[PDB]
C-alpha cells in the first residue's frame with residue numbers, strides 16, 4: 001500500500017497474539033514497543049532520542065506481523081511514548097520512501 | 100526518487116542560504132533543526148520524543164529546499180542531536196511510504 005503523511009503513519013501490528021497500534025518511523029533505527037511481556041532472555045541497550053536516552057530491554061528473533069506482512073527480528077521494550085516500527089523491520093517488509 | 104531504509108535516510112537541504120544534512124523522519128510531526136539563526140519572530144514550544152521533552156523556538160512560513168523541491172512550513176530550532184525533516188514538510192514534497 002501507499003501511505004501519505006498528512007496524519008501519523010499508524011498501522012496495526014500483531015505480536016504475541018495481540019493487536020496493537022504502532023508508528024512507521026523512518027527516523028528510528030530500531031523497533032521499540034511500550035512495556036509488555038515477551039519470551040526468552042533479554043539484553044540491555046540504551047537508545048537516544050530527541051530528548052535524551054532511555055534504557056530498554058532487547059529481545060531477538062521476535063515474530064511480528066505488520067499490516068499482514070510477517071517479520072522476525074529484534075524488538076526493544078521500554079518507556080517509549082508510542083509503539084515504534086523502525087528501519088530494522090521496515091526493511092524486512094520492503095518499505096521505502098518515495099517522492 | 101525511491102529511498103531504501105538499509106541506512107538512515109539522510110538528504111541535503113538548503114535553508115537560509117545554508118546547506119545542511121537532514122533525516123527524512125516519518126515519526127516526527129514537525130521539522131526540527133539544531134541551533135541556528137532565522138529571520139522573523141518566534142514562539143517558545145516544548146516537544147517530546149524518546150527521552151523526554153526539549154524546548155525549541157518555533158518559526159512559521161519558513162522556506163526550505165529538499166532535494167531540489169521547495170517547501171514552506173513551520174521549522175523548530177533547538178537542542179536536537181540531528182536535523183529532522185518531519186511530516187509537515189514531507190507532505191509538501193509529496194513524500195509517501197510504500198511497501
Ligand SMILES: O=C(N[C@@H]1CO[C@H](CO)C1)[C@H](OCc1ccccc1)[C@H](O)[C@@H](O)[C@@H](OCc1ccccc1)C(=O)N[C@H]1c2ccccc2C[C@H]1O
Pocket residue numbers: 023025026027028029030031032047048049050081082084086122124125126127128129130131146147148149180181183185
Ligand atoms: O521523536 C519523535 N517524534 C516527535 C513528534 O514530533 C517531534 C518533532 O516535531 C518529534 C520520533 O519518535 C516517535 C514518537 C512519535 C510521537 C511521540 C513521541 C515519539 C522520532 O522519529 C524518533 O523516533 C527518532 O528521532 C530522530 C533521531 C534520529 C537519530 C538520532 C536522534 C534523533 C529517534 O529518536 N530515533 C532513535 C531511535 C528510536 C527507536 C529505536 C532506536 C533509535 C535510535 C535513534 O534512531
